[PDB]
């Protein structure tokens, strides 16, 4: 039979089409060098233009940005200006139009990750001092004090914050499509965060007094976000070291922002179940 693959509707069978080849060129094919020399064709033709148009030469300087190469016997003409216009459009598109499209989709946003979260009205349940009592005696980012527990707000580095926010957006986008709250679907929703749910009970269950679940790490690296239209993203670490950040010693040695975010999502999803329990277990990088 077929081999099922995870999907928003559960386990389904996947496939592929045959290549068509009718795709318009993307931003990737937009090369500065080819585009610049191209406008030499927009000029007229005649004895005043043939020689100038024939000797057009273009080279890439230090930081890309193809520029015309003036040899020892260059003859100034409008053709130089035409090439200059070519460089302009290649540059302006990259600076102006590419970011607009790049930031328009939750699965490719880079610079506006924080803004996107505000569109989803996302609020973390581990930072409010009046958190729900069911969230455990002491959360991973709380240290006990005589006047009850107290939490500490972490200032993540730039790269880890960008990766974590990007992963959160992807999962939230998937959940807005509606799902059936079963184990197979939930794992797929939160898989970008690199977390997997796993029940503790292995027998029949359905009669015991409590149902317990725990969260396991599927990997020790978020998948970063790539600015350029071509190339793979750069992975970044998902954990944070307590000592390196100079945080109170009472906190756990390693802190996983992804696991905390995933825990909040699942807890809200399965609130209607009256015997749902979470038993978090300490995890360390390999």
């Amino acid at each position: 039979m077929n081999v099922l693959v995870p999907g928003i509707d559960g386990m389904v069978s996947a496939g592929k089409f045959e290549y068509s080849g009718c795709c318009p060129p993307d931003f990737a094919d937009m090369d500065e060098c080819t585009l610049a020399t191209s406008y030499v064709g927009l000029l007229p033709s005649g004895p005043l233009w043939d020689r100038a148009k024939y000797e057009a030469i273009t080279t890439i300087t230090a930081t890309g940005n193809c520029a015309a190469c003036w040899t020892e016997d260059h003859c100034p003409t409008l053709v130089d200006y035409a090439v200059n216009v070519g460089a302009r459009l290649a540059s302006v598109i990259d600076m102006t139009l590419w970011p607009a499209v790049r930031e328009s989709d939750p699965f490719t946003a880079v610079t506006s990750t924080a803004d996107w979260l505000e569109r989803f009205k996302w609020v973390n349940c581990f930072e409010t001092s009046c958190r729900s009592k069911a969230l455990g005696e002491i959360t991973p980012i709380e240290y006990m004090t005589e006047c009850g527990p107290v939490y500490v707000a972490i200032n993540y580095p730039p790269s880890i914050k960008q990766a974590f926010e990007s992963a959160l957006i992807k999962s939230l986008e998937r959940l807005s499509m509606g799902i059936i709250k079963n184990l197979a679907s939930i794992n797929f929703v939160i898989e970008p965060l690199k977390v997997r749910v796993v029940p503790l009970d292995t027998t029949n269950a359905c009669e015991n007094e409590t149902l317990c679940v725990t969260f396991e790490k599927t990997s020790d690296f978020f998948d970063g976000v790539n600015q350029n239209p071509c190339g793979i993203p750069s992975p970044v670490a998902a954990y944070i070291d307590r000592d390196v950040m100079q945080l109170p010693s009472e906190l756990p040695k390693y802190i996983w922002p992804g696991h905390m975010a995933a825990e909040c999502v699942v807890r809200s999803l399965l609130s209607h179940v009256s015997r749902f329990c979470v038993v978090r277990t300490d995890q360390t990088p390999d």
């Binding site: 520029a67 260059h74 130089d80 970011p99 499209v101 930031e103 328009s104 569109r119 996302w122 209607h272």
Partner: protein, 391 residues
């Protein structure tokens, strides 16, 4: 606030100048006043517009910034459409001599509102001589909601009684169209992330029951704590509903809400026989009225227009107040003070009718009217006591 980060203007202007010299002038910079200087500046100006154009086309597709037209087009692609205008509906009783032929174009009138039959009229009156029809307002809008019992035909027909009466209830359900801004918030709420959407889904669904006007969640006073001093979170679903346009003060008897609960959750509840999903248990509540008298002071020095609007605003605020919520003098004072001016001498007081005691009402020291659970503050009368000033 910009989404397309724009480098500093000085950095940009240097970039264009450097590019121009390298390509056209062969490495030499520009003379301060010449054609090359002016064309460079014009090029910078065009770049500014290009940045705006790209950002605008990004702005014009985001739900919270798109135009009033593009917004609906995006909504149509996710199964969300604006609500159209509704027509008031109800039943009407008719009596006449049996046998006389009927007509399809007959229409009625109840307090200047004209209603027409909304169903295929039978050929002639039945033997018993009494007929029941389904009617809808001739014109849409909230004006079709009225609390009346007696009417009369506008187009007399031989053999049919000159007067007709409606059923024990009344006509309601008419509503006006939906504007752009209310639609935008509704669409965004669907796209956003919120816990326990099942509660929200039921709350929205209950608004489709006839005669329902408002849906209110459990009030703050409805919270309870067990003997252990720990707040208790129930696993059921409950909320209030009001019928401001059908019942006195918007409170309905128990029997009416019981029918709604059965339809929403089923009978027995939880087996998915109702509109709710499988394994969902809940109950829809009602409330009891407590009367209140409100006295305004220091309003004589204000112009008559100010007095009229201030009284109107307070009356509206009390009417739509939720059940099981405290009513404090601060809220009313702020509302009026927001119009008169922060320096005005304005004061308000709250007292019960005849200074008698009532169930579920207690006055704290500060003057608030604390209200227990399943109790709504129903306005009784607004009186502006009189003094003499400015003479």
């Amino acid at each position: 606030a910009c989404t397309i980060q724009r480098p500093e203007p000085q950095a940009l202007r240097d970039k264009i100048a450097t590019r121009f010299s390298t390509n056209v002038l062969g490495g030499a910079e520009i003379i301060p006043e010449s054609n090359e200087f002016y064309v460079v500046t014009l090029e910078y100006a065009m770049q500014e517009e290009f940045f705006a154009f790209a950002e605008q086309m990004w702005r014009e597709q985001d739900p919270r910034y798109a135009c009033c037209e593009n917004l609906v087009k995006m909504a149509a692609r996710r199964g969300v459409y604006p609500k159209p205008a509704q027509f008031a509906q109800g039943y009407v009783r008719m009596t006449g001599v049996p046998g006389s032929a009927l007509n399809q174009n007959l229409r009625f009138q109840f307090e200047n509102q004209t209603y027409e039959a909304a169903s295929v009229v039978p050929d002639q009156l039945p033997a018993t001589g009494v007929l029941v029809l389904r009617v809808s307002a001739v014109t849409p809008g909230p004006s079709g909601n009225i609390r009346v019992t007696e009417g009369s035909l506008v187009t007399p027909v031989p053999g049919i009684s000159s007067a007709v009466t409606a059923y024990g209830g009344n006509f309601c359900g008419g509503d006006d169209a939906e504007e752009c801004e209310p639609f935008r918030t509704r669409y965004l709420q669907r796209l956003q992330y919120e816990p326990r959407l099942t509660v929200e889904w039921l709350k929205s669904k209950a608004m489709e029951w006839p005669c329902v006007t408002d849906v209110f969640d459990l009030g703050p006073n409805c919270c309870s704590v067990n003997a252990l001093g720990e707040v208790e979170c129930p696993n059921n679903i409950e909320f209030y509903v009001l019928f401001r346009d059908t019942f006195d003060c918007g409170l309905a008897p128990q029997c009416v809400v019981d029918e709604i609960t059965d339809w929403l959750f089923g009978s027995p509840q939880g087996l998915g026989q109702g509109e709710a999903e499988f394994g969902i248990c809940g109950k829809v509540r009602t409330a009891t009225a407590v009367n209140l008298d409100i006295y305004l002071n220091g309003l004589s020095c204000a112009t008559p227009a100010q007095a009229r609007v201030v009284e109107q605003r307070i009356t509206d605020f009390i009417n739509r107040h939720p059940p099981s919520t405290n009513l404090t003098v601060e809220q009313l004072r702020f509302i009026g003070l927001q119009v008169l001016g922060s320096s005005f001498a304005f004061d308000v007081a709250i007292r019960s009718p005849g200074d008698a005691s009532q169930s579920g009402l207690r006055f704290n020291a500060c003057g608030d009217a604390e209200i227990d659970c399943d109790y709504k503050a129903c306005l009784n009368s607004v009186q502006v006591i009189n003094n003499n000033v400015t003479t």
